[PDB]
Amino acid sequence: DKISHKIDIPDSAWTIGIGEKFKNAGHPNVKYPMIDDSYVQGAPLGGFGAGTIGRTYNGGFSRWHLEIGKNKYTTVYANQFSVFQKVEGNKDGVAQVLYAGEPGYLSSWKWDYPKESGMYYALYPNSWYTYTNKDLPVQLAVKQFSPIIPYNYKETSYPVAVFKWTAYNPTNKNVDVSIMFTWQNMIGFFGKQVNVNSGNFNKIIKDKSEIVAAVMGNISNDNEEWNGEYSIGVKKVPGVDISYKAKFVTTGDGSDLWHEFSKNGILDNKDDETPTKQDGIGSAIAVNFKLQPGQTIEVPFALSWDLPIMKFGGGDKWYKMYTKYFGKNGKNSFAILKEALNNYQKWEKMIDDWQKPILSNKSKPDWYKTALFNELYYLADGGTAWENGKVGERTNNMFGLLECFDYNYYETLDVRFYGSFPLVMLWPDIEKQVMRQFADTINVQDSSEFKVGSNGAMAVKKVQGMIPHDLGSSYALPWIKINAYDWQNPNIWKDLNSKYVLLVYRDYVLTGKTDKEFLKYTWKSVKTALDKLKEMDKDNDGIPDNEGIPDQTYDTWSMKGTSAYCGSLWLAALKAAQEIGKVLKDNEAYIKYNEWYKIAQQNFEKELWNGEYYNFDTESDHKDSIMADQLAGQWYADILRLGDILPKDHVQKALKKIYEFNVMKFENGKMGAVNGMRPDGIVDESDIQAQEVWTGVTYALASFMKYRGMTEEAYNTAYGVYKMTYDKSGKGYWFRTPEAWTKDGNYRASMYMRPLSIWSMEV
Ligand SMILES: [Ca+2]
Numbered sequence: 235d236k237i238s239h240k241i242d243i244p245d246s247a248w249t250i251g252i253g254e255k256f257k258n259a260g261h262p263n264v265k266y267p268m269i270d271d272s273y274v275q276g277a278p279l280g281g282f283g284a285g286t287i288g289r290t291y292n293g294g295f296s297r298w299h300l301e302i303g304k305n306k307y308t309t310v311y312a313n314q315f316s317v318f319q320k321v322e323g324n325k326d327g328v329a330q331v332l333y334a335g336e337p338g339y340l341s342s343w344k345w346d347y348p349k350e351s352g353m354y355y356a357l358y359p360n361s362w363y364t365y366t367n368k369d370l371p372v373q374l375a376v377k378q379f380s381p382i383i384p385y386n387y388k389e390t391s392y393p394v395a396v397f398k399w400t401a402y403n404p405t406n407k408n409v410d411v412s413i414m415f416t417w418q419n420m421i422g423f424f425g426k427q428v429n430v431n432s433g434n435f436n437k438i439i440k441d442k443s444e445i446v447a448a449v450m451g452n453i454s455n456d457n458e459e460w461n462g463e464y465s466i467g468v469k470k471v472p473g474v475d476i477s478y479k480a481k482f483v484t485t486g487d488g489s490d491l492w493h494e495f496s497k498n499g500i501l502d503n504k505d506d507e508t509p510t511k512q513d514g515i516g517s518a519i520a521v522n523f524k525l526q527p528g529q530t531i532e533v534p535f536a537l538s539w540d541l542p543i544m545k546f547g548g549g550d551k552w553y554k555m556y557t558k559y560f561g562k563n564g565k566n567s568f569a570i571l572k573e574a575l576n577n578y579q580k581w582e583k584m585i586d587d588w589q590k591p592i593l594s595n596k597s598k599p600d601w602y603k604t605a606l607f608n609e610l611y612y613l614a615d616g617g618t619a620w621e622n623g624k625v626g627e628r629t630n631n632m633f634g635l636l637e638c639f640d641y642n643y644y645e646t647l648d649v650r651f652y653g654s655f656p657l658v659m660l661w662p663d664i665e666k667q668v669m670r671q672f673a674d675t676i677n678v679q680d681s682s683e684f685k686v687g688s689n690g691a692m693a694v695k696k697v698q699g700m701i702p703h704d705l706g707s708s709y710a711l712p713w714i715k716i717n718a719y720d721w722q723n724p725n726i727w728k729d730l731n732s733k734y735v736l737l738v739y740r741d742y743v744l745t746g747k748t749d750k751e752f753l754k755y756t757w758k759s760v761k762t763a764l765d766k767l768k769e770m771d772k773d774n775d776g777i778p779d780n781e782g783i784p785d786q787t788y789d790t791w792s793m794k795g796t797s798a799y800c801g802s803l804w805l806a807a808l809k810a811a812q813e814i815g816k817v818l819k820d821n822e823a824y825i826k827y828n829e830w831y832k833i834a835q836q837n838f839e840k841e842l843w844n845g846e847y848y849n850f851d852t853e854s855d856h857k858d859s860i861m862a863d864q865l866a867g868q869w870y871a872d873i874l875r876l877g878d879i880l881p882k883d884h885v886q887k888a889l890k891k892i893y894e895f896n897v898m899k900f901e902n903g904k905m906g907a908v909n910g911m912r913p914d915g916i917v918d919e920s921d922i923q924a925q926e927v928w929t930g931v932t933y934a935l936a937s938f939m940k941y942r943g944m945t946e947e948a949y950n951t952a953y954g955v956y957k958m959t960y961d962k963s964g965k966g967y968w969f970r971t972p973e974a975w976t977k978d979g980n981y982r983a984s985m986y987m988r989p990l991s992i993w994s995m996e997v
Contacts, residue, residue: 235366236404237373240530243362244593246603247355248960248968250291252347252363253334260965263980269640270984271297271307273966276354277361278611279380282664283555283620283633284393285541288969289378291354292334293347293363301424301459302544302554303617303708305639305985311337312418312484312516315397315535316344318499319370322408322524328369329496342489344496356969358382358608359585371405372525374413381574381581382614384588384660389581391555391620394570396578397535403525412499414520415535416491417466418484419450419510425460425545435509436480436517439568444470445575446478448517449568453509457625459551462541463567466519469575471533474523477501484514491518498522534578538570543625548711551625558622558631588660592996602949602995605956609992611969613656616987619644619712620664632671632713633664634705638973638986643704643719644712646987647672648787651733652930655993662745666752669741672734675702675716676759686723688784693723699766701730722789728770728778728800729786731763732807736870739810743874744997753814761823764811767804768830775841776833777801780851788909791923795852801838802848802867802879805831809876835879843884847891850910859918862896862907863931864888869938873997889939893947897954901977906932906954908977917977926974929955930988937994952995 250256262268275297280286288297294309311333320327329344336345351367359382365374377398381389403409422430433453440446447467454461470476479501482491494501499522521533542562545551553562560566574581592603617636634644635653645668657665680695696702696717703724706712717724724730738756742749770778778800780786780793786800793800808831815824842848850859865888871879878885892907899915900908908917909931910924918924932955939948958964958979959971965979973983 235364235373237364237366237375237400237402240400240402241362241375241377243355244357246593246600246607247357247362248604248608249353249355251350252352252354253292253349256966258965260967260975260980262982263976263978264982268983269305271305271970273968275969277356277358277608277969278615279378279395279537280393280614281380281382281389281391281556282614282618283391285539285554286614287395288615293332294335298423299615299617300539300541302619303546303636303642304424305617306424309335310418310420311340312416314416315376316414316416316495317365317370317374318410318412318414318495319372320410320498321371322410327410327499329492329499330370332363332365339485340488342487342492356608357589357604358611371407372401372403372409372411375400379582379585380614381584382610383581383584386584387661387663388559390661391559392570392574393539393541393554393556394574395537396574396581397537398578399533399535400530401523401525401533402530403527406527408527409525410499410522411525412495412520412522413533414495414499414501414518415466415468416516416518417448417450417464417537418514418516420464421450421452421462422460425458431510431512431514433509434515435507436515437507438478438480438505441572444476445572446470446476446519447568447571448478448480448519450517451565451567457543457564459541459543459545462539462564465538465567465571466517466535467571467575468519468521468533468535471531473531474521474533477503477520477522479504479518481506481508482516482518484516486513495520534575536571536574536578538567538574540564540567540570544619546712547707547709548715550711550714552619552621553623553625555620555622555631599949601953601956604960605952606992606996608960608968609971609989610656612971612985612987612990615969615985617642617708619708621713630667630670633668634712635987636708637704638983640983641719642707642709644707645671645705646703646719647701647733647737648703648727648729649930649987651737652934652991653987654737654990656990658741658744659993659996662741665741666749669738670755671705671713672701673756673759675705676700676762678702678716684720687721694725697725699762700725701734701763703727703730722784726770726781727785728767728780729803731767732800732803732867734763735760735807735810736803736874739814739874740870750817753817757814757818757820760811760814764807764827775837776830777804777837782853788923791909791921792854793851794854796838796841797851798842798848798861798864799866801834801842802865803870804867805835805838805879806867806871806874806876808834809871809879810874813876839880847888848884854920856910856912856918856920858913859910859920859924860891860895860913862892862909862935864892865938866934869934872938872941873994886942889942889944889947892935893939893944893951897947897951900927903950904954905958905975905977905979907935907951925976926982928974928988929959929971929986930973930991933989933992934994937991937997940995941997948995952992955989
């Protein structure tokens with residue numbers, strides 16, 4: 235490997251061999267159907283709200299999130315990089331697709347890129363491949379990325395990727411090299427109900443100011459989710475020549491293209507705008523160059539996708555964010571690609587600038603850096619919706635991130651309490667917009683009834699003064715029809731209204747305690763939320779009562795009476811609202827929430843403190859279980875700088891107990907914090923959720939330990955999550971971190987919002 239020296243891959247990059255076969259991957263542990271797309275995954279390409287494309291470590295473009303809210307895992311075989319090499323003085327060269335697999339169609343191409351001949355690396359938003367093959371004398375690498383940039387709401391939105399190639403000749407002979415990008419005209423891949431290829435056509439643009447690009451579109455001007463353009467292209471650099479082929483048939487053997495490329499690495503330069511009928515078609519862009527001994531060359535390619543309209547299953551059509559910058563008519567893929575090819579070096583430097591403070595901190599282990607950056611994949615990958623107007627129709631751009639794909643709910647608030655740390659820390663204007671969306675819902679009432687999945691009772695959809703569980707589903711009407719989730723009735727949940735208040739005050743504190751206007755916007759809703767939750771205190775101890783039914787985020791784990799979890803969240807939310815009332819000079823609110831806080835705090839301690847930890851609750855059969863998340867309210871109080879809600883000594887005892895038990899008694903501390911443990915050191919079997927590790931709960935718990943000076947415990951607690959997710963000894967969950975796993979390592983709900991809580995460790 236001579237090429238690693240010519241490029242700059244950080245040591246914290248997650249690595250795997252191209253074509254590596256991972257043994258003992260995990261699978262779902264539920265009885266009902268659940269997504270399992272295998273361990274062949276990679277860092278995604280694409281901006282927020284753009285739709286994303288997962289290119290795997292094997293090289294294939296395979297995990298398609300272009301239909302916003304949907305996950306479609308299928309390798310589109312035509313979409314590849316390929317290489318040709320010929321040593322000067324040899325009769326023939328060699329050509330090879332850079333994909334460790336094979337299709338079917340395209341039989342003429344050279345498939346099956348060999349094992350032990352290159353590596354994949356990822357430190358999101360960058361990823362790299364290196365090609366170090368005994369039969370390719372010139373070594374190659376590519377750095378691929380999208381311009382995902384904190385505090386930037388422009389380039390971060392773009393439907394674009396850059397592929398910056400480096401080629402180096404370590405031999406003492408001249409070598410002719412070509413690199414070719416092929417792409418299928420994928421108009422019609424989704425959204426089009428009939429005639430899926432009909433009207434697709436490809437054009438070639440030559441911009442000599444030099445860029446050569448293919449634009450793959452359709453003759454129709456219909457404004458529908460399926461219509462728009464893909465583009466691939468390359469920028470000329472000194473010493474390379476460009477060739478292209480506008481149209482090859484993807485539903486054929488591929489030899490129309492491959493007989494050209496495999497001869498001398500130079501395409502026919504044949505333009506052909508003829509639309510197709512039933513055949514699939516594609517385009518190819520190639521560079522050819524001669525490398526002398528010891529020579530390096532760098533050449534950038536790009537990919538864009540102008541698919542301006544997203545459609546949701548309830549019928550609404552919206553423009554995607556990036557259309558603010560490029561237009562809405564679906565004929566702008568070249569403009570996007572050109573912007574990338576002319577600015578990518580600037581984008582690289584912007585990414586480096588944001589990653590450097592963390593990477594350069596030599597007190598932090600590399601594994602922690604691997605996880606911290608790579609868990610950010612989900613902000614783009616999570617079905618992200620970011621609108622720039624309804625089709626046919628404002629100041630703001632509404633946003634939503636999915637819980638996951640299995641449970642297709644936007645912005646699920648009980649989960650975003652954990653998962654939204656990156657947004658407040660790195661994209662705070664998005665965060666505050668999401669919270670205003672919630673503020674706007676609090677007094678919505680919908681008295682129509684739904685059947686509750688868990689018990690088949692009927693319940694009201696949305697109750698005035700209750701915060702909604704979620705802002706809809708991609709199968710229905712995001713932002714318009716809220717509370718799509720129906721397994722339980724969230725109108726009686728005991729965590730949502732407290733978590734809402736906590737999120738609001740968090741968002742003020744972590745953006746510098748300056749945004750009084752945000753506090754003013756949300757203040758009515760904060761007071762309403764707490765006032766409604768107080769009505770659920772049926773025994774007058776000052777604390778809302780859990781009802782012996784899963785009425786909080788652990789939506790199968792029953793809490794009854796006063797719980798540590800909901801009780802502590804309530805205490806913290808009261809303390810937050812007192813502080814907001816001080817800031818806004820609302821005396822009656824300050825006085826009232828202070829009174830409620832002092833009574834609730836005294837009763838919480840009396841009811842739950844056992845001398846070692848806080849009991850799970852007051853009335854359940856396993857009320858003395860040790861819950862990993864028992865002090866969630868004090869965790870957030872630390873972040874919000876609200877001081878001690880509970881005594882320091884008791885918090886420290888509780889954290890030490892959770893480490894000793896839920897971590898170190900659970901598979902020797904190598905898999906995270908199990909949710910519930912009995913005081914005899916045995917995992918609590920009262921519900922499945924008690925026997926699960928929740929990845930995002932565990933990362934949050936690690937930040938709480940860290941703030942409380944339990945440094946070793948904090949990083950040991952988090953390390954098990956990192957190991958399970960990314961290490962050779964784990965279960966193969968990279969770029970699909972799940973909600974949960976059990977002792978056996980098998981999972982529930984891959985591609986999950988909650989583990990974004992790792993960013994709470996950077997507060
Ligand atoms: Ca009570």
